Each structure stands twice: as C-alpha cells, then as structure tokens.
Amino acid sequence: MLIAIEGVDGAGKRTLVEKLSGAFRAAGRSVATLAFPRYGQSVAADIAAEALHGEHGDLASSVYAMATLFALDRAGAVHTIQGLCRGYDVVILDRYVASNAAYSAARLHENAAGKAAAWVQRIEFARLGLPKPDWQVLLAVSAELAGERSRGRAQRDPGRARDNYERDAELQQRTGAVYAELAAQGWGGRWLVVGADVDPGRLAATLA
C-alpha cells in the first residue's frame, strides 16, 4: 500500500508520518517511509531547495522550472518506490506528486481544475510513470497556524531558515485551498482530509 501525506508548510506532516508509522507497526505491518524533496539524495532536489533560499539566479521565479525539478527528483526515486512497495506492507510518503499540483496552481493563482495540476498529472503519473498513491491524506490546518510553526522552526534552528514559499503567506493560503479542491476531486486517487487532532490508531485503521 502506498500512502502520501500532503498539506502546507508547517502543517505537522513529518510528525503525522512518525505517528502513523508507529500505529501501523503496532498493528504488525512493516512500514517504510520516504520524504520529498529528497534533500541530499538528488541534485534536482538540492538545487530546488537552494533556489528557494535565493540561489541559482532566476530559477525560482519560474513556476514550471521549480515543478520540473521536484518531478525530476521523484523520477530518480521510481525504482526505489517500486522496491519499497514490494518489500514492505505500507509505504508512507512525506509529500508526493500532489504537492507539485497544489503549489504550482497556487503560485499561478489557478485552481485544482486548472492547467498546472493537469500538467503535473501528465508529466509525473503518465510520462514519468510514478505510481498513483492508494491514499493521499490531507492534513488540513489553518494557514495562520502553519505559518507560525514554520516561523518557530526557523527561530530555534539555524539550519531551518524559511524558504521563499514559506515566507509567502498568501501563497500558503492559496495552496491550502487548492489542496482542499484536489481532495474533493479525488485527484490522483482517493483522499482523506484530517485535522491536527486526528487519531493515529484510527487513521491507520482507515488506511490499512
């Protein structure tokens, strides 16, 4: 089973991944986890991150360039994903293809039925052959609360300064709204929308 955890910056995704993996393991399932972008493991992922911190000239000003780098990062992990799905009961992703649709649409002021989300579908699922997830879980959080979490993280960690997307409050709000539409539409596969108070034991039961 392939599960993707989605949502805006500072939504609590990495914590939900650890809680969910604990819940599956408590129920006897083997769990593997992977997080995109794969910082350190691909040049595409690292250049993208650096571009969001102000490097690499005009790269980050192109919406489709940034999307392409994240897609190329995932394309480098296809055989890895397919291998994990063979070896493990549950594979849990911290961000996946839907992050590219939500952020790209939001940067362009488009909705979930617009051009960017359709491009992401065409490139990543069809052309690059990335598997569609069995479940995509939207961790829906107020944009204000998520933004406070990102700010807090940068304050206490010098290696977690906010990037260009995190600093853009209105982008984060628009991205939350596109994500809600993608879930309602069942984009890429079925979605669950959960809040910050979701129970990990029940959540894993729904997904099992």
Ligand X SMILES: Cc1cn([C@H]2C[C@H](O)[C@@H](COP(=O)(O)O)O2)c(=O)[nH]c1=O
Q: Is the preceding peptide bond at 37 cis, omega within 30 degrees of 0?
A: yes
Closest CB 9 distance from ligand X, rounded Å: 5
List phi, psi (to 5°) of 7: 145, 170
Partner whose binding site includes residue 37, from Mg ion, a second copy, ligand X, none (CB under 5 to 8 Å by kind): ligand X
Only segment of 24-32, 82-90, 99-107, 139-147 that touches ligand X (CB under 6 A): 99-107
Whose CA is closest to 182, among 171, 169, 191, 194? Answer: 191
Residues contacting Mg ion: total by CB under 5 A: 1
List phi, psi (to 5°) of 173: -65, -45
What the block records as the tokens of 83 is 């291998």
**78 touches a second copy (CB under 8 A):** no
**9 touches Mg ion (CB under 5 A):** yes
Which amino acid, residue 198? V
What the block records as the tokens of 39 is 């910082």
Among 69, 112, 198, 204, indicate the residue that binds a second copy (CB under 8 A): 69
**165 touches ligand X (CB under 6 A):** yes
Partner whose binding site includes residue 127, from Mg ion, a second copy, ligand X, none (CB under 5 to 8 Å by kind): a second copy
Distance CA 142, CA 124 (A): 29
**Distance from chain centroid for Cα 117:** 14
Decide whether 56 or 160 has the Cβ nearer to Mg ion: 160
Binding residues for dTMP, by number, are: 9, 39, 70, 74, 95, 100, 103, 163, 165
Binding residues, by number, are: 7-14, 39, 70, 74, 95, 100, 103, 163, 165-166
